[PDB]
Amino acid sequence: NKFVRAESIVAKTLATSREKERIKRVSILEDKKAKNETQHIASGKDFILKITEGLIREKTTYDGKPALLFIVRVRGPLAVNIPNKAFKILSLLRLVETNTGVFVKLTKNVYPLLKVIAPYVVIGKPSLSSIRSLIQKRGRIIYKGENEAEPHEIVLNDNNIVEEQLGDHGIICVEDIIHEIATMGESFSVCNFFLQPFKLNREVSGFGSLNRLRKIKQREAESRTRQFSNAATAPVIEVDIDSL
Amino acid sequence: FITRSQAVRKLQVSLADFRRLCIFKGIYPFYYAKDIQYLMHEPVLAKFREHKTFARKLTRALGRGEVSSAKRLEENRDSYTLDHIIKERYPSFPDAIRDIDDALNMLFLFSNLPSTNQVSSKIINDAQKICNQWLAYVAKERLVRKVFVSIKGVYYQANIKGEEVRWLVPFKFPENIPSDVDFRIMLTFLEFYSTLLHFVLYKLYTDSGLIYPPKLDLKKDKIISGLSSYILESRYDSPVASLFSAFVFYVSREVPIDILEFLILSCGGNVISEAAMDSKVTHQIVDRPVLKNKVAGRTYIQPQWIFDCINKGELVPANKYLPGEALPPHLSPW
Amino acid sequence: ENYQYDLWGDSTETNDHVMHLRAPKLPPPTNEESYNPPEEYLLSPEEKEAWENTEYSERERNFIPQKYSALRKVPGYGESIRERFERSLDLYLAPR
Amino acid sequence: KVPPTIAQFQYTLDRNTAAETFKLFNKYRPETAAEKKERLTKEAAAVAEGASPKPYAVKYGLNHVVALIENKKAKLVLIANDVDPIELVVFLPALCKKMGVPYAIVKGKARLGTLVNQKTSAVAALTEVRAEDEAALAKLVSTIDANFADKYDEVKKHW
C-alpha cells in the first residue's frame, strides 16, 4: 500500500526497455534460424558457455543430442518487470516463485526458449547424486487431503502414494521416479509434473550482522560466476549444479 | 543448591548463553551450587563475551558503510573450541563411547534434513560427512551385532571397543520440519556432539584402523554420495563379522540402498546396485509382487532375510523370504 | 587440521568419582513395534482414537503400531525430529 | 528567540536531494587506516622486488576546508547544523556565500562522519572529482543552488 518513489518508477521502465528490446532481438534471430533464411544474421548456430572452478570460460557448440537440465530460479535483474514472453515460459515451467527448481530435457525446440529466460534462471546438467539427494530431501505431491480439501501439497514420505498416483505406468516407488528422471524414459513426462516444482532454500537466508556481509560476498560472486550477454547470439551459461 | 534465576545472575550471562554452557558442560537441575560455582572460570564463557564484542564491532563497520574493514574483521576472528570441555566431561575414552549412544542419534537425524533459514547447508554437509565416516568405520572393522527396522527408522547395535553402542537412522525421505521445534537448542547439541565425534573418530582410526581424515573420490560422490563412495586406506571375532563372506549381492532399485549396503559390507558381502548404472552375483534383493527376469543363477530375496541373518547369526533359510509372499512376524532383538 | 589429535591417550580415570555425576541413562531398548509386527500389537480401532484422546507425555507409546507387508511400503516417520528434540530437552531441563 | 545567522541552520537540505548528495559523496571515500596500510605493504612487497595518479577523496578538516573555501579549490561544501559550539561554524555559510562557493547545510553531524571514516566531521567538502562524475557534481551543485540557496534567500533575515 506504500508510496512509490519517482526514481524507482522510471528505473522499472528504463530496465524493461532493455528487456523488451532484448527479448524481441533474440526472438527475431531464433525465428530466422529455424526457417533456414540465414542470409544476413549474426550467427546461424548455437554456442554453450560452461563456467567452472580461477574461472575458466569454455566455448562449446550445442549438439543435437537431448540432454538433462536442472533449471534453478535466481531473481535477476534488479528493476525489471517480467514481459509477456517471460510470463509464458515461466508459467509453462511453473517457476513464478523465487528459489525454485524443475527438471526438463533440452532439445532443439527447448534451447531457443532457454535464451529468453536466461537472465531469470541458472541452468546446468546435474549428476546422479544431485538428482537423487534432491528428491529424497525435497518433494511435493498435490493431491486430496482428508475427505474434502484438494490443494494439499505435503511430502514424498511414502511409496504407496506413488503407487496410487502413478502405478500402471511401471512406477512403484520414489527410487523408480529417480530412475525415470536421471535416465530419459517413457514415464518422465508423467513424473515430472508429479513432483511439480522443488522448493530450494535461498542462499545465506538472513538480514543481520553475519548474514548481510555473507550476502554481500555472494552478491559480488554472482556477477563473476554469471554474465548477462544481452545480444541475439547469447551463449547459454551452464554452471556446476553439483557445487550449487 | 541455587535457583535458575540465581545461577543466571551470578554468572552475569544471558539465559540462552547460560543454557548453551549448560548443554556443553553437561549440567542439569535447583542446580548444584559447586557446579555453577565451577562453571564461572572457564574459557568458553570468555569466548562468548568475545563473540558479543565482535557482533557490535562488525555491525559498526556494516552500519557505517565500510565493507573492507568488516571483511577484515572476519579474517581476524577466532572462535571457541569445545576441546578441553570433553576432557573434563569424559576423561576416559570408554566413557565417551557411553555417551556416543545419544550423540549419534542427533547427528544421523540432522543428515536427513532439508536446510532451512534456521540451519545452514554447511551444518548438514559436515554432519553428513561425520555420519559417513562413522558408517565407513563400522563397515571397515566389521562391528555390527544387531539390527532392527521399525516405523521410526532403523536401529543398529555395535561393539565399539566392546561396550555395545545403539543408534537410530531415519528413512531417506523428505522430512516435514515443524515450526514448533526450536532449532537453536538442537544446534548447540549438534555443536557439542559434532566435536565429540571428531575426537572419537580420530581415536578409533589412529588406534586400530586408518588415516584420519580419509579422502573421497569425486566421481564416486557424483554417483552415490553414500557409502560405496569415500574410499579409506589403512597405512573375525564375532559370527556376524564372518557371515556373507564370499557372497555377492545385487541390490535392486526398489529397496533403500544406504540402509542395506552398510549391512552387507559390514558382515562381508559385496554390493552391485541398479542405481550405479544410471557376474559373480549369487543373491538379488527385490521388493516387487511381480518379478520379471527370474534366472537360474541367482537366489531371490526380500530384505527381511538380511534383517534376520544379522539378529540370529546362523544364516536363516530363504524359503520364508521369496518375492511375492507374506513375511514372518519380525521380532525385536530385545 | 581441526580436531585432529588424540586427547584421551592412556586414560584410565573415571568421572563417576563424586556421587553427583548422574549418568544420563541410555533410552529404553525398543520392544516389538517393527514395520512388520505380530499383528496382535496392531491396535484396535477404538484405542486408535483413545490414544489420540490422551494428552502427550502421559502416554505409553509415542506412535501408533502399524503393519506393513512390504519394506518399500514403510512411510517416512513424520514425528522423528520431535522425539530427538524432546530427548535433548530431557537432558538439560529434567531433574536427575 | 534566534538571531538570523544562527538558525540560518535548521533550514537544511531536503530528503531526495540529501540522499543524492551522498550518492555522489560515498563515491569519494578516503581510504581507511587498515586499507592505507595494506596498500603500502602491497607496495613494499612489490617495490622491494620490482606510476600512480593523484587520488580524489573528499576533504574533511574544518581548517583544511576553511583553507579550501577562500582559495577556490572547493566546489561543494557540506555543513552539519548540530555542533557542540555552534560558533565553530556560524561564519562558514556566509564565508562561502562571499567566495561564491556552493554550500549546503546537511542534517546529521554523524552523517558527515560516515562518509569520511570518522565519528563526526562538522564539515566535509568535495574539492576535486573524477572525469565521469564531473557533470554529476556540477548538476548537484545547481540542484543545491535551487532548493537551498534560492529557496532560502530569506535565511539571512527573520529571527
PDB file of all heavy atoms in Angstrom, chain B residues 28-29 87-90 102 203 287 304 328-330 332 334, chain C residues 5-6 8-9 15 20 22 31-32 34-36 72 87:
ATOM      1  N   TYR B  28      22.788 -30.134  34.701  1.00  0.00           N
ATOM      2  CA  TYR B  28      21.361 -30.431  34.751  1.00  0.00           C
ATOM      3  C   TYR B  28      20.812 -30.019  36.115  1.00  0.00           C
ATOM      4  O   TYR B  28      21.579 -29.959  37.084  1.00  0.00           O
ATOM      5  CB  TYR B  28      21.146 -31.932  34.532  1.00  0.00           C
ATOM      6  CG  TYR B  28      22.167 -32.801  35.239  1.00  0.00           C
ATOM      7  CD1 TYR B  28      21.935 -33.278  36.533  1.00  0.00           C
ATOM      8  CD2 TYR B  28      23.379 -33.136  34.616  1.00  0.00           C
ATOM      9  CE1 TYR B  28      22.873 -34.072  37.181  1.00  0.00           C
ATOM     10  CE2 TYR B  28      24.327 -33.919  35.262  1.00  0.00           C
ATOM     11  CZ  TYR B  28      24.065 -34.386  36.540  1.00  0.00           C
ATOM     12  OH  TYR B  28      25.004 -35.162  37.174  1.00  0.00           O
ATOM     13  N   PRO B  29      19.494 -29.719  36.205  1.00  0.00           N
ATOM     14  CA  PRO B  29      18.914 -29.465  37.527  1.00  0.00           C
ATOM     15  C   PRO B  29      18.916 -30.721  38.401  1.00  0.00           C
ATOM     16  O   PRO B  29      18.794 -31.836  37.888  1.00  0.00           O
ATOM     17  CB  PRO B  29      17.481 -29.022  37.213  1.00  0.00           C
ATOM     18  CG  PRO B  29      17.201 -29.554  35.854  1.00  0.00           C
ATOM     19  CD  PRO B  29      18.509 -29.479  35.133  1.00  0.00           C
ATOM     20  N   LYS B  87      37.471 -33.328  27.824  1.00  0.00           N
ATOM     21  CA  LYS B  87      38.444 -33.872  28.792  1.00  0.00           C
ATOM     22  C   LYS B  87      37.920 -33.855  30.232  1.00  0.00           C
ATOM     23  O   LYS B  87      38.164 -34.791  30.999  1.00  0.00           O
ATOM     24  CB  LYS B  87      39.772 -33.104  28.745  1.00  0.00           C
ATOM     25  CG  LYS B  87      40.716 -33.459  27.608  1.00  0.00           C
ATOM     26  CD  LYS B  87      40.568 -32.483  26.452  1.00  0.00           C
ATOM     27  CE  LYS B  87      41.914 -32.082  25.869  1.00  0.00           C
ATOM     28  NZ  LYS B  87      41.760 -31.165  24.702  1.00  0.00           N
ATOM     29  N   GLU B  88      37.210 -32.783  30.587  1.00  0.00           N
ATOM     30  CA  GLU B  88      36.605 -32.632  31.913  1.00  0.00           C
ATOM     31  C   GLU B  88      35.228 -33.303  32.026  1.00  0.00           C
ATOM     32  O   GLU B  88      34.720 -33.494  33.134  1.00  0.00           O
ATOM     33  CB  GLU B  88      36.566 -31.148  32.333  1.00  0.00           C
ATOM     34  CG  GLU B  88      35.725 -30.216  31.458  1.00  0.00           C
ATOM     35  CD  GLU B  88      34.287 -30.062  31.941  1.00  0.00           C
ATOM     36  OE1 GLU B  88      34.057 -30.037  33.172  1.00  0.00           O
ATOM     37  OE2 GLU B  88      33.384 -29.958  31.084  1.00  0.00           O
ATOM     38  N   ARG B  89      34.643 -33.658  30.881  1.00  0.00           N
ATOM     39  CA  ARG B  89      33.337 -34.322  30.835  1.00  0.00           C
ATOM     40  C   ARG B  89      33.471 -35.844  30.695  1.00  0.00           C
ATOM     41  O   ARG B  89      32.851 -36.594  31.455  1.00  0.00           O
ATOM     42  CB  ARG B  89      32.462 -33.734  29.719  1.00  0.00           C
ATOM     43  CG  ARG B  89      30.988 -34.092  29.829  1.00  0.00           C
ATOM     44  CD  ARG B  89      30.127 -33.271  28.882  1.00  0.00           C
ATOM     45  NE  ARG B  89      28.794 -33.864  28.738  1.00  0.00           N
ATOM     46  CZ  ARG B  89      27.758 -33.298  28.121  1.00  0.00           C
ATOM     47  NH1 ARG B  89      27.857 -32.088  27.579  1.00  0.00           N
ATOM     48  NH2 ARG B  89      26.602 -33.944  28.055  1.00  0.00           N
ATOM     49  N   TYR B  90      34.268 -36.280  29.720  1.00  0.00           N
ATOM     50  CA  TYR B  90      34.577 -37.694  29.506  1.00  0.00           C
ATOM     51  C   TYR B  90      36.097 -37.879  29.524  1.00  0.00           C
ATOM     52  O   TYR B  90      36.742 -37.829  28.471  1.00  0.00           O
ATOM     53  CB  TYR B  90      33.936 -38.210  28.205  1.00  0.00           C
ATOM     54  CG  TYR B  90      32.475 -37.845  28.075  1.00  0.00           C
ATOM     55  CD1 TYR B  90      32.054 -36.871  27.159  1.00  0.00           C
ATOM     56  CD2 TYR B  90      31.507 -38.454  28.885  1.00  0.00           C
ATOM     57  CE1 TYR B  90      30.711 -36.521  27.046  1.00  0.00           C
ATOM     58  CE2 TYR B  90      30.166 -38.108  28.786  1.00  0.00           C
ATOM     59  CZ  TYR B  90      29.774 -37.140  27.865  1.00  0.00           C
ATOM     60  OH  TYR B  90      28.444 -36.802  27.769  1.00  0.00           O
ATOM     61  N   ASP B 102      23.637 -41.377  22.543  1.00  0.00           N
ATOM     62  CA  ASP B 102      22.760 -40.233  22.295  1.00  0.00           C
ATOM     63  C   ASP B 102      23.331 -39.262  21.253  1.00  0.00           C
ATOM     64  O   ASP B 102      22.577 -38.522  20.613  1.00  0.00           O
ATOM     65  CB  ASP B 102      22.467 -39.496  23.606  1.00  0.00           C
ATOM     66  CG  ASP B 102      21.252 -38.590  23.510  1.00  0.00           C
ATOM     67  OD1 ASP B 102      20.116 -39.111  23.483  1.00  0.00           O
ATOM     68  OD2 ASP B 102      21.435 -37.355  23.465  1.00  0.00           O
ATOM     69  N   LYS B 203      40.471 -40.984  17.438  1.00  0.00           N
ATOM     70  CA  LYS B 203      40.945 -42.006  18.378  1.00  0.00           C
ATOM     71  C   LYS B 203      40.762 -43.424  17.834  1.00  0.00           C
ATOM     72  O   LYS B 203      41.665 -44.252  17.963  1.00  0.00           O
ATOM     73  CB  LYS B 203      40.265 -41.855  19.749  1.00  0.00           C
ATOM     74  CG  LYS B 203      40.655 -42.891  20.805  1.00  0.00           C
ATOM     75  CD  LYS B 203      41.987 -42.595  21.472  1.00  0.00           C
ATOM     76  CE  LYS B 203      42.166 -43.428  22.729  1.00  0.00           C
ATOM     77  NZ  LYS B 203      43.546 -43.301  23.273  1.00  0.00           N
ATOM     78  N   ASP B 287      11.932 -56.044  -4.001  1.00  0.00           N
ATOM     79  CA  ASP B 287      10.625 -55.807  -3.377  1.00  0.00           C
ATOM     80  C   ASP B 287       9.525 -55.452  -4.390  1.00  0.00           C
ATOM     81  O   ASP B 287       9.024 -54.321  -4.429  1.00  0.00           O
ATOM     82  CB  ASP B 287      10.731 -54.744  -2.269  1.00  0.00           C
ATOM     83  CG  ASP B 287      11.189 -55.321  -0.933  1.00  0.00           C
ATOM     84  OD1 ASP B 287      10.966 -56.526  -0.671  1.00  0.00           O
ATOM     85  OD2 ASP B 287      11.760 -54.553  -0.131  1.00  0.00           O
ATOM     86  N   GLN B 304      14.080 -58.674   4.493  1.00  0.00           N
ATOM     87  CA  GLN B 304      13.772 -59.301   5.790  1.00  0.00           C
ATOM     88  C   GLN B 304      14.732 -60.447   6.177  1.00  0.00           C
ATOM     89  O   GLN B 304      15.057 -60.615   7.361  1.00  0.00           O
ATOM     90  CB  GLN B 304      12.305 -59.768   5.764  1.00  0.00           C
ATOM     91  CG  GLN B 304      11.798 -60.581   6.952  1.00  0.00           C
ATOM     92  CD  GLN B 304      11.615 -59.776   8.222  1.00  0.00           C
ATOM     93  OE1 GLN B 304      11.001 -58.708   8.223  1.00  0.00           O
ATOM     94  NE2 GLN B 304      12.129 -60.304   9.324  1.00  0.00           N
ATOM     95  N   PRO B 328       7.625 -63.406   7.736  1.00  0.00           N
ATOM     96  CA  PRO B 328       7.488 -63.763   9.160  1.00  0.00           C
ATOM     97  C   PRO B 328       7.425 -62.535  10.092  1.00  0.00           C
ATOM     98  O   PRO B 328       7.977 -61.487   9.741  1.00  0.00           O
ATOM     99  CB  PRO B 328       8.749 -64.593   9.443  1.00  0.00           C
ATOM    100  CG  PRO B 328       9.699 -64.242   8.357  1.00  0.00           C
ATOM    101  CD  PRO B 328       8.834 -64.023   7.157  1.00  0.00           C
ATOM    102  N   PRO B 329       6.772 -62.668  11.275  1.00  0.00           N
ATOM    103  CA  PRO B 329       6.424 -61.550  12.177  1.00  0.00           C
ATOM    104  C   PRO B 329       7.531 -60.608  12.698  1.00  0.00           C
ATOM    105  O   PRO B 329       7.217 -59.681  13.449  1.00  0.00           O
ATOM    106  CB  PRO B 329       5.740 -62.260  13.353  1.00  0.00           C
ATOM    107  CG  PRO B 329       5.157 -63.485  12.749  1.00  0.00           C
ATOM    108  CD  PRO B 329       6.208 -63.938  11.781  1.00  0.00           C
ATOM    109  N   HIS B 330       8.791 -60.844  12.309  1.00  0.00           N
ATOM    110  CA  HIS B 330       9.945 -59.948  12.580  1.00  0.00           C
ATOM    111  C   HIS B 330      10.058 -59.412  14.024  1.00  0.00           C
ATOM    112  O   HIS B 330       9.663 -58.276  14.324  1.00  0.00           O
ATOM    113  CB  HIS B 330      10.018 -58.816  11.530  1.00  0.00           C
ATOM    114  CG  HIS B 330      11.214 -57.920  11.669  1.00  0.00           C
ATOM    115  ND1 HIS B 330      12.511 -58.392  11.660  1.00  0.00           N
ATOM    116  CD2 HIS B 330      11.307 -56.577  11.804  1.00  0.00           C
ATOM    117  CE1 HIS B 330      13.348 -57.377  11.793  1.00  0.00           C
ATOM    118  NE2 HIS B 330      12.643 -56.265  11.882  1.00  0.00           N
ATOM    119  N   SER B 332      11.840 -58.203  17.649  1.00  0.00           N
ATOM    120  CA  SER B 332      12.929 -57.344  18.125  1.00  0.00           C
ATOM    121  C   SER B 332      14.060 -58.177  18.729  1.00  0.00           C
ATOM    122  O   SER B 332      13.802 -59.259  19.269  1.00  0.00           O
ATOM    123  CB  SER B 332      12.420 -56.365  19.185  1.00  0.00           C
ATOM    124  OG  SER B 332      11.310 -55.625  18.720  1.00  0.00           O
ATOM    125  N   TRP B 334      15.342 -57.408  21.408  1.00  0.00           N
ATOM    126  CA  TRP B 334      15.220 -57.028  22.822  1.00  0.00           C
ATOM    127  C   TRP B 334      13.834 -57.347  23.381  1.00  0.00           C
ATOM    128  O   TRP B 334      12.820 -57.192  22.700  1.00  0.00           O
ATOM    129  CB  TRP B 334      15.545 -55.540  23.019  1.00  0.00           C
ATOM    130  CG  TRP B 334      16.909 -55.140  22.506  1.00  0.00           C
ATOM    131  CD1 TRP B 334      18.117 -55.432  23.076  1.00  0.00           C
ATOM    132  CD2 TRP B 334      17.196 -54.387  21.318  1.00  0.00           C
ATOM    133  NE1 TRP B 334      19.139 -54.906  22.320  1.00  0.00           N
ATOM    134  CE2 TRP B 334      18.606 -54.259  21.235  1.00  0.00           C
ATOM    135  CE3 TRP B 334      16.401 -53.802  20.315  1.00  0.00           C
ATOM    136  CZ2 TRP B 334      19.243 -53.571  20.187  1.00  0.00           C
ATOM    137  CZ3 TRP B 334      17.036 -53.113  19.270  1.00  0.00           C
ATOM    138  CH2 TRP B 334      18.445 -53.008  19.217  1.00  0.00           C
TER     139      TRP B 334
ATOM    140  N   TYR C   5      43.849 -34.598  16.684  1.00  0.00           N
ATOM    141  CA  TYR C   5      44.805 -35.074  17.685  1.00  0.00           C
ATOM    142  C   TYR C   5      44.072 -35.891  18.747  1.00  0.00           C
ATOM    143  O   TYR C   5      42.918 -35.596  19.080  1.00  0.00           O
ATOM    144  CB  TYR C   5      45.576 -33.903  18.326  1.00  0.00           C
ATOM    145  CG  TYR C   5      44.760 -33.006  19.242  1.00  0.00           C
ATOM    146  CD1 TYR C   5      44.794 -33.180  20.632  1.00  0.00           C
ATOM    147  CD2 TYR C   5      43.965 -31.973  18.722  1.00  0.00           C
ATOM    148  CE1 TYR C   5      44.051 -32.364  21.479  1.00  0.00           C
ATOM    149  CE2 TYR C   5      43.220 -31.150  19.561  1.00  0.00           C
ATOM    150  CZ  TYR C   5      43.267 -31.351  20.939  1.00  0.00           C
ATOM    151  OH  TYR C   5      42.534 -30.543  21.776  1.00  0.00           O
ATOM    152  N   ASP C   6      44.742 -36.917  19.268  1.00  0.00           N
ATOM    153  CA  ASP C   6      44.224 -37.696  20.388  1.00  0.00           C
ATOM    154  C   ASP C   6      44.318 -36.858  21.659  1.00  0.00           C
ATOM    155  O   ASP C   6      45.341 -36.209  21.913  1.00  0.00           O
ATOM    156  CB  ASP C   6      45.005 -39.008  20.542  1.00  0.00           C
ATOM    157  CG  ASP C   6      44.411 -39.949  21.597  1.00  0.00           C
ATOM    158  OD1 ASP C   6      43.353 -39.647  22.196  1.00  0.00           O
ATOM    159  OD2 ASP C   6      45.017 -41.017  21.829  1.00  0.00           O
ATOM    160  N   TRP C   8      42.580 -38.239  24.755  1.00  0.00           N
ATOM    161  CA  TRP C   8      42.478 -39.220  25.835  1.00  0.00           C
ATOM    162  C   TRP C   8      43.822 -39.899  26.109  1.00  0.00           C
ATOM    163  O   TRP C   8      44.334 -39.824  27.230  1.00  0.00           O
ATOM    164  CB  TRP C   8      41.387 -40.255  25.534  1.00  0.00           C
ATOM    165  CG  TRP C   8      39.996 -39.687  25.548  1.00  0.00           C
ATOM    166  CD1 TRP C   8      39.219 -39.455  26.647  1.00  0.00           C
ATOM    167  CD2 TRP C   8      39.213 -39.288  24.414  1.00  0.00           C
ATOM    168  NE1 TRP C   8      38.005 -38.934  26.272  1.00  0.00           N
ATOM    169  CE2 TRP C   8      37.971 -38.820  24.907  1.00  0.00           C
ATOM    170  CE3 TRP C   8      39.443 -39.274  23.029  1.00  0.00           C
ATOM    171  CZ2 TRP C   8      36.958 -38.340  24.064  1.00  0.00           C
ATOM    172  CZ3 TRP C   8      38.430 -38.798  22.187  1.00  0.00           C
ATOM    173  CH2 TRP C   8      37.203 -38.339  22.711  1.00  0.00           C
ATOM    174  N   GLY C   9      44.387 -40.539  25.080  1.00  0.00           N
ATOM    175  CA  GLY C   9      45.637 -41.297  25.195  1.00  0.00           C
ATOM    176  C   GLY C   9      45.469 -42.516  26.082  1.00  0.00           C
ATOM    177  O   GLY C   9      44.561 -43.326  25.868  1.00  0.00           O
ATOM    178  N   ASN C  15      34.963 -40.359  35.672  1.00  0.00           N
ATOM    179  CA  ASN C  15      34.359 -39.114  36.154  1.00  0.00           C
ATOM    180  C   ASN C  15      33.270 -39.349  37.208  1.00  0.00           C
ATOM    181  O   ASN C  15      32.850 -38.409  37.892  1.00  0.00           O
ATOM    182  CB  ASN C  15      33.806 -38.290  34.985  1.00  0.00           C
ATOM    183  CG  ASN C  15      33.930 -36.786  35.205  1.00  0.00           C
ATOM    184  OD1 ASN C  15      34.334 -36.320  36.275  1.00  0.00           O
ATOM    185  ND2 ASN C  15      33.574 -36.018  34.184  1.00  0.00           N
ATOM    186  N   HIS C  20      27.853 -37.109  42.613  1.00  0.00           N
ATOM    187  CA  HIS C  20      26.958 -36.148  41.975  1.00  0.00           C
ATOM    188  C   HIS C  20      26.854 -36.232  40.449  1.00  0.00           C
ATOM    189  O   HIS C  20      25.996 -35.571  39.858  1.00  0.00           O
ATOM    190  CB  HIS C  20      27.287 -34.723  42.412  1.00  0.00           C
ATOM    191  CG  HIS C  20      26.233 -34.103  43.271  1.00  0.00           C
ATOM    192  ND1 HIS C  20      24.910 -34.026  42.889  1.00  0.00           N
ATOM    193  CD2 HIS C  20      26.307 -33.517  44.487  1.00  0.00           C
ATOM    194  CE1 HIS C  20      24.214 -33.425  43.838  1.00  0.00           C
ATOM    195  NE2 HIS C  20      25.040 -33.103  44.817  1.00  0.00           N
ATOM    196  N   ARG C  22      25.314 -37.786  37.719  1.00  0.00           N
ATOM    197  CA  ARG C  22      24.191 -38.617  37.317  1.00  0.00           C
ATOM    198  C   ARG C  22      24.302 -38.902  35.821  1.00  0.00           C
ATOM    199  O   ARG C  22      24.013 -38.034  34.989  1.00  0.00           O
ATOM    200  CB  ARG C  22      22.857 -37.940  37.663  1.00  0.00           C
ATOM    201  CG  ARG C  22      22.395 -38.118  39.106  1.00  0.00           C
ATOM    202  CD  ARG C  22      22.985 -37.070  40.036  1.00  0.00           C
ATOM    203  NE  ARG C  22      22.586 -37.279  41.429  1.00  0.00           N
ATOM    204  CZ  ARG C  22      21.708 -36.531  42.097  1.00  0.00           C
ATOM    205  NH1 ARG C  22      21.109 -35.493  41.520  1.00  0.00           N
ATOM    206  NH2 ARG C  22      21.429 -36.818  43.362  1.00  0.00           N
ATOM    207  N   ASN C  31      10.955 -52.356  22.072  1.00  0.00           N
ATOM    208  CA  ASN C  31      10.280 -53.640  22.283  1.00  0.00           C
ATOM    209  C   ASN C  31       9.047 -53.833  21.396  1.00  0.00           C
ATOM    210  O   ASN C  31       7.959 -53.326  21.700  1.00  0.00           O
ATOM    211  CB  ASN C  31       9.935 -53.836  23.774  1.00  0.00           C
ATOM    212  CG  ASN C  31       9.601 -55.285  24.126  1.00  0.00           C
ATOM    213  OD1 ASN C  31      10.000 -56.226  23.435  1.00  0.00           O
ATOM    214  ND2 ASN C  31       8.870 -55.466  25.224  1.00  0.00           N
ATOM    215  N   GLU C  32       9.253 -54.556  20.293  1.00  0.00           N
ATOM    216  CA  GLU C  32       8.187 -55.123  19.441  1.00  0.00           C
ATOM    217  C   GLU C  32       7.206 -54.106  18.836  1.00  0.00           C
ATOM    218  O   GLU C  32       6.013 -54.098  19.168  1.00  0.00           O
ATOM    219  CB  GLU C  32       7.448 -56.267  20.169  1.00  0.00           C
ATOM    220  CG  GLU C  32       8.332 -57.387  20.719  1.00  0.00           C
ATOM    221  CD  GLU C  32       8.903 -58.307  19.650  1.00  0.00           C
ATOM    222  OE1 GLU C  32       8.216 -58.580  18.644  1.00  0.00           O
ATOM    223  OE2 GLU C  32      10.049 -58.771  19.830  1.00  0.00           O
ATOM    224  N   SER C  34       8.027 -53.065  15.242  1.00  0.00           N
ATOM    225  CA  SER C  34       8.624 -53.045  13.901  1.00  0.00           C
ATOM    226  C   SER C  34       7.645 -52.788  12.750  1.00  0.00           C
ATOM    227  O   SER C  34       6.425 -52.859  12.929  1.00  0.00           O
ATOM    228  CB  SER C  34       9.364 -54.361  13.652  1.00  0.00           C
ATOM    229  OG  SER C  34       8.485 -55.470  13.692  1.00  0.00           O
ATOM    230  N   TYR C  35       8.205 -52.499  11.574  1.00  0.00           N
ATOM    231  CA  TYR C  35       7.451 -52.309  10.328  1.00  0.00           C
ATOM    232  C   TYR C  35       6.559 -53.510   9.984  1.00  0.00           C
ATOM    233  O   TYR C  35       5.467 -53.349   9.431  1.00  0.00           O
ATOM    234  CB  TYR C  35       8.411 -51.983   9.174  1.00  0.00           C
ATOM    235  CG  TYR C  35       9.166 -53.166   8.592  1.00  0.00           C
ATOM    236  CD1 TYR C  35       8.808 -53.702   7.349  1.00  0.00           C
ATOM    237  CD2 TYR C  35      10.245 -53.746   9.276  1.00  0.00           C
ATOM    238  CE1 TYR C  35       9.494 -54.782   6.805  1.00  0.00           C
ATOM    239  CE2 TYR C  35      10.936 -54.827   8.741  1.00  0.00           C
ATOM    240  CZ  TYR C  35      10.555 -55.341   7.502  1.00  0.00           C
ATOM    241  OH  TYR C  35      11.234 -56.407   6.962  1.00  0.00           O
ATOM    242  N   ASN C  36       7.052 -54.703  10.316  1.00  0.00           N
ATOM    243  CA  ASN C  36       6.292 -55.940  10.248  1.00  0.00           C
ATOM    244  C   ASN C  36       6.211 -56.517  11.668  1.00  0.00           C
ATOM    245  O   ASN C  36       7.131 -57.216  12.100  1.00  0.00           O
ATOM    246  CB  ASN C  36       6.954 -56.922   9.267  1.00  0.00           C
ATOM    247  CG  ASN C  36       6.162 -58.211   9.078  1.00  0.00           C
ATOM    248  OD1 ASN C  36       4.968 -58.288   9.378  1.00  0.00           O
ATOM    249  ND2 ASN C  36       6.834 -59.236   8.565  1.00  0.00           N
ATOM    250  N   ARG C  72       9.262 -51.553   1.170  1.00  0.00           N
ATOM    251  CA  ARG C  72       9.055 -50.358   0.341  1.00  0.00           C
ATOM    252  C   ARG C  72       7.847 -49.537   0.816  1.00  0.00           C
ATOM    253  O   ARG C  72       7.809 -48.322   0.625  1.00  0.00           O
ATOM    254  CB  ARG C  72       8.892 -50.739  -1.142  1.00  0.00           C
ATOM    255  CG  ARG C  72       7.685 -51.623  -1.423  1.00  0.00           C
ATOM    256  CD  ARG C  72       7.344 -51.770  -2.892  1.00  0.00           C
ATOM    257  NE  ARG C  72       6.009 -52.357  -3.029  1.00  0.00           N
ATOM    258  CZ  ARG C  72       5.547 -52.981  -4.111  1.00  0.00           C
ATOM    259  NH1 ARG C  72       6.303 -53.130  -5.192  1.00  0.00           N
ATOM    260  NH2 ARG C  72       4.313 -53.466  -4.105  1.00  0.00           N
ATOM    261  N   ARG C  87      14.044 -35.421  23.731  1.00  0.00           N
ATOM    262  CA  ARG C  87      15.138 -36.073  24.456  1.00  0.00           C
ATOM    263  C   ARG C  87      16.230 -35.066  24.843  1.00  0.00           C
ATOM    264  O   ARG C  87      16.745 -35.108  25.969  1.00  0.00           O
ATOM    265  CB  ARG C  87      15.711 -37.256  23.663  1.00  0.00           C
ATOM    266  CG  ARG C  87      16.984 -37.844  24.255  1.00  0.00           C
ATOM    267  CD  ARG C  87      16.863 -39.338  24.498  1.00  0.00           C
ATOM    268  NE  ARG C  87      17.900 -39.821  25.414  1.00  0.00           N
ATOM    269  CZ  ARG C  87      17.806 -39.844  26.742  1.00  0.00           C
ATOM    270  NH1 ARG C  87      16.711 -39.409  27.362  1.00  0.00           N
ATOM    271  NH2 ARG C  87      18.819 -40.308  27.460  1.00  0.00           N
TER     272      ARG C  87
END
